[PDB]
């Protein structure tokens, strides 16, 4: 039996890739680490550092206010360690010299394990969700869960995934990815081919990368005197159910809106004295696939409909996948990041890839699709966003995000004024460090 | 990986496969239409890269393995499922069924006492989907016919996703820890949470 070399031509010529010339070395990662670890590791490692840089730097400063076992790491992956996996299965069958640490480095948890060894050094919780496409929001859910039970007072939530050869061929075979040869035939440039809610949406663009957020106890954030980017009012993952049909998408994310005034979505809002009308923005998963977009729209339309959303007070929705493409593991975190930036700046990002809204989506009146940026100035505030992501195999998720200034209202005027003093001093010192 | 020192003898190939040959080598490989049969001849010149089969002897001759003769079919899993899903999936699928059997059977009986969105699935993996992963990276590089659902089936979360589709049908939470060796206890932690 002989195995003889051949070749194949494939459909996907384009992906959303980290800007050419990126190096973990430029960021200051040692060459020994770059070698020993998977490419996906370099993404989560640098992201964690820059995530901390938002507030504090030295990870052990956390051990001043907190016992080290109260530091948690919740980090999601759709796959993770992809390179290190494909490195073993090639290498072993090929007898090529490959690293001995391969199986350790292919564990989707080992990447943040590398970060905990290299940086934070926490003695506390480590969790590593698999949400397929939804890991990011699924990770936030558990990061939230770890804090409220006193298991850990400081958590790192996030998700990350990589784009390699056999990642592409799995999607393209599954038919879920947009076929580039067809896009060029329709006169579509590489930047314009990811279009959410568009009539012509042909399926998703695959991407690579990673992102993380630092979730903490509200009391600790004041005490440490760090920046408050936003309040997470809720987080949930949701399954769908028994069915045979492959195009049939999961609708189970509606379970959060169940009960109306008694619903988890509305009560989360109500505890801040916020109403259902006060959610202006939903960040859709917006995969640009024909299956996901109308379903997620019908989903968001219905969760608003039953909770008594005032007629024609539509949720203004952004699609970040039209820009950044779809990175499986780190999907909802990039949306999580964008949502925080939405709340503080007030600005609602456009979908610039939208030529025409799908005529099917007309039936949804609680939903508005904006093609041009609506920039909210000082006289035009905003309140609360919602991150929604649908993973593969009935993985659906929802994260309700609320403006920071809602939390500052619980301090009383004396302590509220005292906190703004500390937060102001931190921003100046934070700008310095950065 | 070995470099061919002198030109290899021509072999018959299809036009689609032979044009592909040219896309790798092209200075180093040569392909022609055969006028009568419309197919192509593939001739590798000197300097081409060839991958030649060999073998290795390894240290581990023993492992702890599920008793010989185990079948998901005997437990009653349909042949369509056995095919389409990774071996690891057959483990979590049958285990979930037998896990329920400790108390109730019909997973929808849970929906009598509980709204379906209050059913959660927290299922850990160190890797998971290993077979389906090694199936793609071999298969693709080997051009062998392999399933189209591979990347979906390699997601460590897809295994209990398969169980939720096939059995419980819950509308609620799904989490999938990676604890390396500790996923199991790490999973319980989040299930508790």
């Amino acid at each position: 039996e002989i195995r003889v070399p051949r070749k194949t031509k494939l459909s996907r010529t384009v992906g959303a890739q980290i800007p050419t010339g990126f190096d973990p070395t430029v960021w200051g990662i040692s060459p020994d680490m770059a070698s020993s670890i998977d490419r996906v590791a370099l993404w989560n490692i640098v992201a964690t550092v820059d995530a901390f840089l938002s507030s504090g730097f030295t990870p052990t400063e956390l051990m001043r206010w907190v016992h080290p076992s109260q530091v948690a790491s919740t980090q999601g992956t759709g796959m993770g360690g992809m390179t290190s996996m494909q490195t073993m299965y090639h290498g072993n069958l090929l007898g090529r010299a490959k690293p001995n640490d391969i199986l350790q480095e292919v564990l989707p948890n080992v990447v943040a394990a590398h970060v905990m060894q290299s940086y934070v050094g926490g003695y506390g919780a480590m969790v590593h969700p698999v949400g397929a496409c939804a890991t990011a929001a699924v990770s936030v859910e558990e990061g939230v869960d770890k804090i409220k039970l006193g298991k850990a007072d400081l958590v790192i939530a996030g998700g990350f995934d990589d784009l390699t050869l056999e990642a592409i061929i799995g999607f393209g075979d599954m038919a879920a990815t947009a076929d580039t040869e067809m896009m060029r035939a329709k006169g579509i440039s590489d930047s314009k081919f990811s279009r959410a809610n568009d009539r012509r949406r042909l399926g998703f663009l695959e991407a690579q990368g990673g992102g993380t957020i630092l979730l903490a106890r509200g009391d600790l954030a004041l005490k440490m005197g760090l920046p408050v980017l936003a309040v997470v009012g809720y987080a949930q993952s949701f399954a769908d159910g028994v069915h045979t049909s492959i195009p049939a998408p999961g609708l189970g994310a509606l379970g959060a809106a169940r009960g109306g005034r008694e619903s988890t979505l509305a009560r989360s809002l109500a505890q801040l004295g916020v109403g259902a009308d006060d959610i202006a923005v939903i960040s859709k998963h917006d995969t640009s696939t024909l299956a996901n977009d109308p379903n997620e729209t019908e989903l968001h339309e219905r969760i608003a409909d039953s909770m008594g959303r005032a007629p024609g007070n539509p949720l203004f929705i952004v699609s970040q996948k039209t820009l950044t493409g779809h990175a499986k593991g780190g999907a909802a975190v990039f949306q999580m990041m964008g949502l925080c930036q939405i709340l503080r700046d007030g600005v609602i990002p456009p979908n610039r890839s939208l030529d025409c809204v799908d005529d099917e989506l007309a039936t949804s009146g609680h939903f508005v699709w904006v093609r041009e940026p609506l920039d909210l100035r000082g006289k035009f505030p905003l309140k609360a966003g919602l991150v929604t992501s649908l993973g593969f195999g009935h993985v659906s998720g929802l994260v309700a995000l609320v403006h920071p200034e809602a939390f500052i209202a619980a301090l009383d005027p004396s302590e509220r004024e005292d906190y703004r003093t500390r937060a102001e001093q931190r921003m100046l010192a934070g700008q310095r460090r950065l | 990986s070995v470099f061919l020192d002198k030109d290899f003898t021509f072999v018959v190939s299809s036009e689609a496969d032979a044009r592909a040959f040219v896309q790798f080598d092209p200075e180093h490989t040569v392909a022609r239409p055969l006028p009568d049969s419309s197919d192509w001849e593939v001739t590798r010149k000197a300097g081409t890269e060839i991958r030649v089969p060999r073998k290795t002897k390894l240290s581990r001759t023993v492992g702890a393995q599920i008793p010989t003769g185990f079948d998901p079919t005997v437990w009653g899993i349909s042949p369509d499922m056995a095919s389409s899903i990774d071996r690891v999936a057959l483990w979590n699928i049958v285990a979930t069924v037998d896990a329920f059997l400790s108390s109730g059977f019909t997973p929808t009986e849970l929906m009598r006492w509980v709204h379906p969105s209050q059913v959660a699935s927290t299922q850990g993996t160190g890797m998971g989907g290993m077979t389906s992963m090694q199936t793609m990276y071999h298969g693709n590089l080997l051009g062998r016919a392999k399933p189209n659902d591979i990347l979906q089936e390699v997601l460590p979360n897809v295994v209990a996703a398969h169980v939720m589709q096939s059995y419980v049908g819950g509308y609620g939470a799904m989490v999938h820890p990676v604890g390396a060796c500790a996923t199991a206890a790490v999973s319980v932690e989040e299930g508790v949470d």
Binding site: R6, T13, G21 | -
Partner: protein, 145 residues
């Protein structure tokens, strides 16, 4: 007369040297009215986002947000991307400044947009797959029968 008016040009003296750079990022507050009680909410039971970051096709969270909201980079936008893409390097050798990494040329902050951003846009965001693995899925992917 009008072709001549178009054919007859002239040069009005313009002496200009422009540069691009900015202060550290600030925050613009929003006007929100809130009627609230203080002690009612338990801070221990609340989850708050302290910070966050991302690594993606558009760069970090700062540059990606600029491209998403604006559609064009600021001074700090191109400066950061050129740094991340490794266009600009820092030498302690004499002349002591920012240098182009490719050609080994000293650069200021102004010309960053002119000399780079055109190439930055092409080689950042979404583009044809650049092969760092010596394999192209779309062109040629190794097969063994």
């Amino acid at each position: 007369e009008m072709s001549g008016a178009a054919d007859e040009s002239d040069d009005e003296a313009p002496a200009g040297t422009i540069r691009a750079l900015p202060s550290p990022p600030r925050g613009y507050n929003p006007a929100p009215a809130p009627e609230w009680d203080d002690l009612d909410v338990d801070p221990a039971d609340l989850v708050v986002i302290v910070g966050g970051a991302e690594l993606g096709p558009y760069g970090s969270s700062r540059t990606r947000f600029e491209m998403e909201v604006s559609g064009e980079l600021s001074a700090a936008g191109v400066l950061e991307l050129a740094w991340t893409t490794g266009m600009v390097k820092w030498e302690d050798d004499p002349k002591a400044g920012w240098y182009d990494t490719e050609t080994g040329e000293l650069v200021p902050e102004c010309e960053i947009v002119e000399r780079y951003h055109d190439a930055v846009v092409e080689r950042c965001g979404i583009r044809e797959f650049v092969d760092d693995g010596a394999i192209d899925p779309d062109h040629a992917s190794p097969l063994l029968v």
